[PDB]
Amino acid sequence: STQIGGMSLDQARTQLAPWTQRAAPIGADEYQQRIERARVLMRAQGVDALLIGAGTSLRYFSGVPWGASERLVALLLTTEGDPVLICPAFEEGSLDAVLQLPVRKRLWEEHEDPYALVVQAMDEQHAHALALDPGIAFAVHTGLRAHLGTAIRDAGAIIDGCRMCKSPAELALMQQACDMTLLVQRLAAGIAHEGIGTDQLVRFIDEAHRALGADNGSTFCIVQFGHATAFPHGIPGVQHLRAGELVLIDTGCTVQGYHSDITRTWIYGTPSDAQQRIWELELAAQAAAFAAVRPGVACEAVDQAARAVLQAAGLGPDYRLPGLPHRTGHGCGLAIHEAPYLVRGNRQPLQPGMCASNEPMIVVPGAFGVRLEDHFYVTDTGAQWFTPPSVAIDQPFA
């Protein structure tokens, strides 16, 4: 190997300059385009009002990046006019400073009923067919239902109808985040040595993400050694690296809210025949899944292409272990997981601009797991990798 081990912490740090290729933020015109696309989808669904809660969908339509809390902060979009922004009174100044869209502020003091404000705004515009953000807390349904007597639809089709296909600016922001995380993955492999701790790697990866100018360091970071790699959702526990162990690292960051999410699995020292066999199979399943992607292709077909490779090698079938116990991938954007899902049963056709992970992890019970994760986006004629796949068990980077 020329990529694994052999780099000091100081040497890694010389490569950690703030990222010089900064993708442009989403502009005012694009936020308006998103509002207009939602209105088209609302009309198709027969909905005349849309309530978006704080979180990734509020940031999508308005630029407000705040996480959801027990206090209602929401955008109410109707067929005409600037959308209504419902917000705590004490937050008005902070809101003005992050909004990217002209809005009609409706402010509530702490003891006042914010749900009443939503319905009042609906009534003023003669709206009586609300679709509610499926990511919003159920408590908001309770609050609304105290004032509303009409059917409340689930807004998922509208929200996915907008967010699944990324604009060039969105792709560029995801691209930047992916490029940064790919470097961090490379440096993490470089500094690995006998005895190094999983916690030491997590800490360095966060440090590197910050140094490169991520929104907020590592969004998340999973580091697993040896038998711990057999768990897609294993408990964090400190391990120290021994020769002969696989190392699995899954991490990512955000840039203007847009996510990277890359997994590398590589050998420290000499691999066993079994580790070698399963690693090559993982790459082949990932490759086949990618090869299945072009416009019009059903999402489940991408999952099945990966399973076909595993089955031909005598793993599986279906979700059986040794094999692939979960879906092949998930969409990615302002959220770590979003539509479309590359999962059995999903007939959703792939369209240009859709972004998804490609990670058909193999688990061998009691032994290890191998997960390669790279994201792609659909193009007019096929697909494009955000990051190129690994080359070999001891060459994690193309």
Place this chain on the structure above:
Amino acid sequence: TQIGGMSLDQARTQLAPWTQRAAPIGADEYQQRIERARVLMRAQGVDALLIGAGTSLRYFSGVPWGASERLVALLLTTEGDPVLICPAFEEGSLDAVLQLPVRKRLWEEHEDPYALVVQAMDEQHAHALALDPGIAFAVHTGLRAHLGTAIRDAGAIIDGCRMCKSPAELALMQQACDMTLLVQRLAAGIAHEGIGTDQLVRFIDEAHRALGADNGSTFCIVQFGHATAFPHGIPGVQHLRAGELVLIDTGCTVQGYHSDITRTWIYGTPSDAQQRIWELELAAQAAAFAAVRPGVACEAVDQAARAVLQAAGLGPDYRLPGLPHRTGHGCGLAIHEAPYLVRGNRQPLQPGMCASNEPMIVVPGAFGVRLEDHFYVTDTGAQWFTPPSVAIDQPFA
């Protein structure tokens, strides 16, 4: 003497792993929480309770996982081990975190998890479901596809369990507060002219980790000078100058239980206005604490703080200069939870309830002063988790 003068190396000699470790919640207490939920369910005519991944699932089952698009949930009915609905591929990991005996019902990726919930309801002849108000609305959509019956809001049941803390819960929160109080103290000590907000944030995370928090700082806000007048403003690096107030709001978790402490202190010489407002903030916090005892409505605690501000000529109500938001919020496995110390909330305080006391004063465009310490209700009054600040230049008792 508490502010400035300490080197980074001096501070680090006080950062050994915490030696007074509170005991983790035991198996018997999880059973007590389930039984308490069942009593409250029955009292409300509810025969099934669905708890989603998040702080309530951790409360009842020990599972710490954050919510995702995949349903992970506990279904509690009137009898038998509660049902745990979980993706099949996660069973192994689920087993390793569960603190409660359960009946696992596993779904493969293409299968409908909502169907499992309703199958489990039907098996026990349940048809009066209450649903976790913190769960994604998507779950209502999924359940409604399968149910003709009302899906009630489980907030009253869940709060009825979680608002009053056990001794073990208090001890875990107490440990988190003690650790964060030390980190706050060390942060004041290493402060110096030109120090960066980002530098303080990093130290505070380093300190939380060294002491043995679950995962460093849960959050950390550090603001200098006029920035203190903008509590929810866009973060941007500042460098400290003499004459500026410093506001630090940070916390950690211990076994999931939260600390959340704010200190505001002067670096250098304060102005008369800074001084007078700081004193008023302390007095508002103290009056709110003095109103706390069993039987007092939560809104009276908020009003006690406002009364102090209005007697001094600030406000009234939420007007500025003054207190533009509520006086405080409950705290436990979540940073914010019931009960809320807010106008309109008639909820009577009961022994064991935990809440923040933080009646911040904002002077628009100038500065803000926030003192935040949490308390719990005792049999006859209240107890501070951490003692309040003493002066504008003595943040620690």
